[PDB]
């Protein structure tokens with residue numbers, strides 16, 4: 533298990549997200565679905581010139597999987613996935629510009645315009661686990677409960693084929709995001725034109 537320190541500006545951003553009073557927390561889902569959509573666009577584009585890149589799975593989609601027993605909301609996609617090196621994700625300029633925009637009157641919902649929307653997951657999650665599998669590499673598990681560090685390890689869990697899975701270990705007061713009606717409402721409000729099927733699993 534390898535432990536790394538976040539870049540100073542990212543640790544500052546994560547503390548801002550965790551500490552700031554901001555009621556509109558539902559925007560985390562739009563950000564994560566947008567990231568999945570980008571990864572799906574990338575495999576779709578790459579697979580035009582190299583169709584063998586789909587040997588690890590032809591279906592391009594997003595699954596939303598709530599689990600009330602584990603208090604987790606999982607966002608799974610069959611996008612391009614990330615190599616250990618990719619897992620390189622640069623965000624310095626975006627973070628600086630976002631924190632500068634907040635000081636000038638922007639709100640936390642504009643986070644995606646700065647390439648750092650992933651960190652909005654910490655509005656609702658005490659811990660985030662990201663499992664990823666790229667064609668050119670092994671399956672990896674990234675994880676952070678903030679506090680300025682994150683870990684990376686080779687993942688021994690169920691093989692994914694290709695893509696990325698974000699597991700949000702929800703905060704005790706944020707279990708509304710495990711409810712079918714609530715997730716449906718959010719997807720309809722913020723992610724209705726995403727160009728891939730979004731399947732909301734039932735428990």
Ligand SMILES: Cc1cccc(Cc2n[nH]c3cc(O)c(C(=O)N(C)c4ccc(N5CCOCC5)cc4)cc23)c1
Pocket residue numbers: 564566567568570571572609611612613614618619621646647648649650662664674695696698
């Ligand atoms: C821990 C950790 C490390 C790295 C990146 C993330 C962010 C993330 N959240 N949900 C995802 C779903 C994915 O399919 C990918 C994925 O497989 N890929 C290839 C991917 C897709 C989009 C981005 N962009 C989007 C615009 O802002 C800049 C980042 C970057 C890489 C990643 C993410 C999290």
